[PDB]
Design a protein around this nucleic acid. Structure first.
Ligand SMILES: [Mg+2]
Ligand SMILES: [Mg+2]
Length: 115
RNA sequence: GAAGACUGGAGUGCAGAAGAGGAGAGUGGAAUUCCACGUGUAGCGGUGAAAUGCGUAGAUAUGUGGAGGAACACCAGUGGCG
């Protein structure tokens, strides 16, 4: 019995996580690639992202909602599968906003690999 | 070498110009970490594959607030100063 939810998709090189929340920040249900029962490196596949997004949409619809807002972060490739699954589950999306955090030359990054 | 004479060298005068040149004091935003509190449940992280590791004493995620330190995205350019 909540409308106007928000979806947070965190898709990285190793996993993807979908958070469904109210318009304020209180979570309702969540689903991750490993929560579906997947193995390790297989979590990065966009197929697992599609499955996780479908599961999150179904769990959100169990309590019922109509519209949704999409926030984007992470460098993973499971983004498109997640957003298309959210579209196909019956939820309309007002807009997609990217919230990938970029610093203004803040803390130094860890050293490059194979050195 | 000595005594004179002259401005091309050199320097001063007068009028403008540009610059991350140097020292001192104060301030700003983005982000990371830690702490406290709401929502929420079983994984998160990582790799060529894994595992050590954190997590039901309740993470990862998300919202609010607080503490502190370091570095200054776009401008940015075989551009500039020494
Ligand atoms: Mg001259
Ligand atoms: Mg938190």
């Amino acid at each position: 019995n909540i409308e106007s939810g928000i979806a947070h998709i965190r898709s990285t090189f190793n996993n993807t996580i979908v958070m469904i929340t109210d318009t304020h920040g209180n979570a309702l249900a969540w689903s991750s690639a490993g929560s579906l029962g997947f193995k390790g490196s297989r979590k990065s596949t966009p197929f697992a992202a599609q499955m996780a997004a479908e599961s999150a949409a179904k769990s959100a619809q169990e309590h019922g909602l109509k519209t949704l807002e999409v926030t984007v972060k992470g460098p993973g490739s499971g983004r498109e599968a997640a957003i298309r699954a959210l579209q196909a589950a019956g939820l309309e999306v007002t807009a997609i906003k990217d919230v990938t955090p970029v610093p203004h030359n803040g803390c130094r990054p860890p050293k490059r690999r194979r050195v």
